[PDB]
Design a binder for this molecule. Sequence first.
Ligand SMILES: [Zn+2]
Ligand SMILES: [Zn+2]
Lengths: 111, 113, 52
Amino acid sequence: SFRFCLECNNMLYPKEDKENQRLLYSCRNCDYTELAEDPKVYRHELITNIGETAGIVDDIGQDPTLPRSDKECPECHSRDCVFFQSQQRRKDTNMTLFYVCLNCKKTFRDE
Amino acid sequence: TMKEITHAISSAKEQVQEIIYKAQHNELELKPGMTLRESFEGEVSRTLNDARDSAGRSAEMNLKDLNNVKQMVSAGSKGSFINIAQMSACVGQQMVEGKRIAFGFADRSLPHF
Amino acid sequence: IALDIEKAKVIQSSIEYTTLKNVTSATEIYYDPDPTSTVIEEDFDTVEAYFS
Ligand SMILES: [Zn+2]
Ligand SMILES: [Zn+2]
């Protein structure tokens, strides 16, 4: 996550002080400068799993084309649920199922 | 023979169901040089092909010598084993571009599934 | 090597191309102005063990 300038709404690029030895987020369109909280400047994931379970909506139980199972809900122990596979559509994607209860509407696995 | 063919096809469908469950619980062996989805598709296709071959072999063994289709196939003048299998026992798996029927709709082949 | 599986696997491993990107999983950039110490707590023990 990256922060924005509080006065002109531009991006806050990180900057390093030679004399003070501190990491600071500074806007290049002004003189505003705010002290950085964490040193994690950049992170790149070669193999990522985000978007696998992130594709979830709160009204997925009203879809009539989705199959319905009788798996046990971990939270409220309901007897009706709706399952589907991974929303990510790469070639390496697993065939595991995500179950959605019809009362608490949370996503849970079978393992 | 029709009972035997029905039993063979039902056993194959149960085997395919077991393969589906194993692939959906990460218990499937991966063929080297291929992904999980490709290995699953190849194994299901192999099972269904073996099912059609077994049903056809049962049907072709049932036939008498006086059977006319058998006489034509045995003379070598017209027809083969696959024709007898498809006419009498099972048409089998339909392949488009060397793969099973794709999901032309949103995650299904027809709006009836 | 043709009638032994282990030597064949050794040859296979020695032939196949393997880059850093294959074994790498994630790369990160951190700010740390102390050459001899570090800010990260998980790796602090290991790096101080190295320096000592
Ligand atoms: Zn600014
Ligand atoms: Zn529930």
